Amino acid sequence: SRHEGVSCDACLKGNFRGRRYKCLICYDYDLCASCYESGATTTRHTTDHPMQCIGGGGSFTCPYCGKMGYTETSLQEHVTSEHAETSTEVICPICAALPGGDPNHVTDDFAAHLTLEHELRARL
Ligand SMILES: [Zn+2]
Ligand SMILES: [Zn+2]
Ligand SMILES: [Zn+2]
Ligand SMILES: [Zn+2]
C-alpha cells in the first residue's frame, strides 16, 4: 500500500509504496524502505537511531458480505473471486487501518481498488 501523506526525508519521494520506517529520535522523520535498508542518513539522523516500521499485517472485513478475519492477501482473493462484478459503494477497510490512510476511501469498484492501491508485494 502507499503511505499517504508521508515523504522520505532522504530521497524526498512521497506517498511511497512498501514499508515505512519512522525515527524515534528525530522529529517527524521517515524513511522509505530503500533508504532505510541502505543506511541513508541526513544532517540530524544516524543509523544508530531507533526506528519503527509502520504498516503491514492486520485482519480485514469484506465490505460486501461482512465476513471478518481476512489478511490483505486473502481479502483480495475473496473479493476478486466472489464480488468482482458489483457496483455498491463501500469504504476500504485497509486504507482506514493504515496511519495516514484515507479514513473514508469510498469506491464502487473495490476489487479494482485492491488490485491498484494494495498490491501484494512487500516492496509495494
Ligand atoms: Zn527514500
Ligand atoms: Zn533519527
Ligand atoms: Zn465478501
Ligand atoms: Zn484502500
Numbering used by the authors: 2 to 125
Sentences from the paper on this structure:
Among the >600 human ubiquitin ligases, UBR4 plays a particularly important PQC role, being an essential and conserved E3/E4 ligase found across eukaryotes. Aside from teaming up with various ubiquitin ligases, UBR4 activity is linked to two specific cofactors: calcium-binding protein calmodulin (CALM1) and KCMF1 (13, 16, 17, 20, 21). Our data show that the evolutionarily conserved UBR4 complex forms a megadalton E4 arena, in which inward-facing ZZ-DZB domains of KCMF1 act not as E3 ligases but as substrate receptors. The architecture of the E4 megacomplex is conserved across eukaryotes, but species-specific adaptations allow UBR4 to perform its precisely tuned quality-control function in diverse cellular environments.
Because the ZZ-DZB motif of KCMF1 has been implicated in binding Arg N-degrons, we measured the binding of the isolated ZZ-DZB domain to synthetic peptides by isothermal titration calorimetry (ITC). Screening additional peptides revealed tight binding to an NRT motif, and the co-crystal structure captured specific contacts with both the T2 side chain and the N-terminal amino group. ITC binding studies showed that the second residue is more important than the first, as an NLT peptide also interacted with the ZZ-DZB domains but NRL, NRR or NRA peptides did not. A threonine at position 2 is characteristic of many processed mitochondrial proteins, for example identified TnSSBP1 (NST) and TnACADS (NFT) and previously co-purified human proteins such as ABHD10 (NKT), SARS2 (NTT), ACOT9 (NLT) as well as the Dengue virus protein NS5 (NGT) binding UBR4 (36). In agreement with these data, E4 assays showed stronger chain extension on a substrate with an NRT motif compared to other N-termini. The pronounced preference for threonine in position-2 points to the targeting of processed mitochondrial proteins, eventually leaking from mitochondria into the cytosol, as can be now explored in vivo.
